[PDB]
């Protein structure tokens, strides 16, 4: 018997979390987005599909700022991405509140990392349907 894939935090007998693997499928199905690191910064870019002439050009911005120095872009379920970014924004505010300095990008990466991991621990949540490219410049 199987059904190891019906429920978020279940290990399959080869040790895999099928729900996460299916969340990847929603990502793969998304618009392409990318990031390139240059030698003093980073660049983010993304493909936005024009479903129709009716979309106002320039207006449905996909890339998001966190704090003042972090950019994130993502492919997959767009609302999931926003929710990730709302969390990132709380997470950087808190860090800045307590420590005065703006959040270092490695620190910030782990904050998103832990939160997204959290959503693979329980069957009462679903995993994120995005992959996020993100980064910026910090004290080093």
């Amino acid at each position: 018997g199987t059904g190891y894939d019906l429920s978020n935090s279940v290990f399959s007998p080869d040790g895999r979390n099928f729900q996460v693997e299916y969340a990847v499928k929603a990502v793969e199905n998304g618009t392409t987005s990318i990031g390139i690191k240059c030698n003093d910064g980073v660049v983010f870019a993304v493909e936005k599909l024009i479903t129709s002439k009716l979309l106002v050009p320039q207006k449905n911005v996909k890339i998001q700022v966190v704090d003042r120095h972090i950019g994130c872009v993502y492919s997959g379920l767009i609302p999931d991405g926003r929710h990730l970014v709302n969390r990132g924004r709380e997470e950087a505010a808190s860090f800045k509140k307590l420590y005065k300095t703006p959040i270092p990008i490695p620190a910030f990466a782990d904050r998103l990392g832990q939160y997204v991991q959290a959503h693979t621990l329980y069957n009462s949540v679903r995993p994120f349907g995005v992959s996020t490219i993100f980064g910026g410049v910090d004290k080093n």
Partner: protein
């Protein structure tokens, strides 16, 4: 329920034909100890707004960090942050005023008198006051603490009702403001010679002058004063 510890004295301000001026000295007093000497109490927010703060300095610093956060937050998912959707002085004011009144309602005030000065996007001058009680008011001139008693009378000589605003220039407003800092330094035991001043002008933008000094101080007559009544030498 608290008590101010490190404090800033008057913030004074007025409006002129094309904008607002606002000034505050650089001292953080600790009761009667003139403790700190490079304290900035004018907070620029965006290119159209200065927030002048008196009262408790710890609370000042807290308001300062709130204001940074407003700028961050307004920037988020906002392609028009540097254009039509910038922070207006009126928005920054309603925000502070809400905070001040909520904190008085919880019996735990931010111990300050604040003046928001700036220019609205349509060019209109903005000058409004809020304090630890959440009490708010506007006037062509506005001053806090000691300034209300000594600066207002002089600033009101220059701009006395609304119709004086179109008649009054930056040169004349700045003159009046600078003059008032001089008078406040003469008689306020919690004031400093050093001050910051800011002009927010609908054409020329925000001008922020640091490290000003009270000029042209009359002290000569002091040599002819002996005794307290009957003494001769």
């Amino acid at each position: 329920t608290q008590q101010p510890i490190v404090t800033g004295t008057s913030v004074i301000s007025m409006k002129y034909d094309n904008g607002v001026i606002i000034a505050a000295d650089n001292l953080g007093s600790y009761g009667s100890l003139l403790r700190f000497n490079g304290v900035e109490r004018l907070i620029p927010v965006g290119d159209n707004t200065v927030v002048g703060i008196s009262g408790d300095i710890s609370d000042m610093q807290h308001i300062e960090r709130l204001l940074k956060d407003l700028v961050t937050e307004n920037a988020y998912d906002n392609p028009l942050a540097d254009a039509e959707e910038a922070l207006e002085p009126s928005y920054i004011f309603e925000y502070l005023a809400t905070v001040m009144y909520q904190r008085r309602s919880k019996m735990n005030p931010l111990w300050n008198a604040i003046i928001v000065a700036g220019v609205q996007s349509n060019g209109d001058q903005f000058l409004r006051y809020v304090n630890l009680l959440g009490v708010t008011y506007s006037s062509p001139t506005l001053a806090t603490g000691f300034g209300a008693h000594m600066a207002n009378p002089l600033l009101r000589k220059v701009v006395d009702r609304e119709s004086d605003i179109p008649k009054t220039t930056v040169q004349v407003a700045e003159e009046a403001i600078v003059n008032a800092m001089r008078v406040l330094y003469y008689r306020d035991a919690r004031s400093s010679r050093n001050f910051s001043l800011a002009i927010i002008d609908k054409n020329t933008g925000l001008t922020f002058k640091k490290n000003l000094q009270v000029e042209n101080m009359k002290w000569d007559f002091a040599k002819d004063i002996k005794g307290y009544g009957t003494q001769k030498i």
